[PDB]
Structures are given as C-alpha cells and as structure tokens.
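YTH domain-containing protein 1, pasting as requested.
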Amino acid sequence: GTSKLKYVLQDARFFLIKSNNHENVSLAKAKGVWSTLPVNEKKLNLAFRSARSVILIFSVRESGKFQGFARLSSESHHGGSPIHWVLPAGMSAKMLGGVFKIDWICRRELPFTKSAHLTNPWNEHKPVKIGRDGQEIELECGTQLCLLFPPDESIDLYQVIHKM
Ligand SMILES: CNc1nc(Cl)nc2c1ncn2C
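Structure tokens follow.
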C-alpha cells in the first residue's frame, strides 16, 4: 500500500542531496544520519522547523540514479563520534560536522530515465534529476518523484507518522 506514504509526504518539503560517492550514502542507510555543507546545513535546519516532514532525496553523482529518500528526524547536532565519511577533494571533516538524524522511507534506487517527465519549478523547470546539492524541489514534483520509487517493503512508516 501507499496510503501511509502519501500521508507522510503531505505538505512535506523536499531537498535534492548530491553525494560525490556511494560510500557515504551507504553509511547513511546503515546509520540513519546525514551531513552536508554549512550552507545547506542552515537551510535544512530552517525547513525542519517549518514543515511536518522534510524529505531528502539522494543521488550519487555519475550514477544516473537516485538511491532512495529519507525524512529528517532532527536538526543538525555536533559533538559526536566522527562519522567516517569518505571525503572528496576539497571536502574536510569540519565542513560535514553537523549530523542530522534521518528515518529512511525508501532505500531502493530509481533511474533518472524514469523521472524524465518531472521538472522542478524551483530550478527553472529543468528535469528534477538536475540540481546542485541542497536544491529544493517543489511540493508536487517532489511528491510525484517519491511516488515513482519502487515500494520498500522492509520499512514500516507507523513510527515515522508518530514522529510527525
Ligand atoms: C556526507 N555528506 C556528503 N558526502 C559526499 Cl561524497 N558529497 C557531499 C556530501 N554533502 C554534499 N556533497 C557534495
């Protein structure tokens, strides 16, 4: 079924996350955390207070796919056992210092070929696959993109709904 999923996405906000490598997305799936650059960190903290759900939709660069989507369960927090992110060039551990907790909604992939009919009004109506890390996706486009993912039958949204 999709009814609880649609309830979680109701009036949600959506942000595109572009990860430079697969390792960090795998780590996020295993540990339920994400970290971003300070400019996007501030944006996500503001959104977390503003909406019933904030959804991160993940895409590893050069993969041609999205790798899933997750809901923020907290604002960013510092002061913890360092998440062993794989850092690309120019990326330092301090720039990824804020850790958001997230609850995965779908850990299944979706190829960009299946989202070619969705454009994002907040990025000049370019295909939704196009955008830098942190690009906000307008409500209707983000809802339809999330609904395109294959169902993840390993997940129970009952606990997510009560976090709302
Ligand atoms: C753990 N967070 C991240 N990991 C990698 Cl590899 N790239 C990122 C990123 N946040 C923004 N970008 C471009």
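Note for the archive: The two ends are 20 Å apart (CA to CA).
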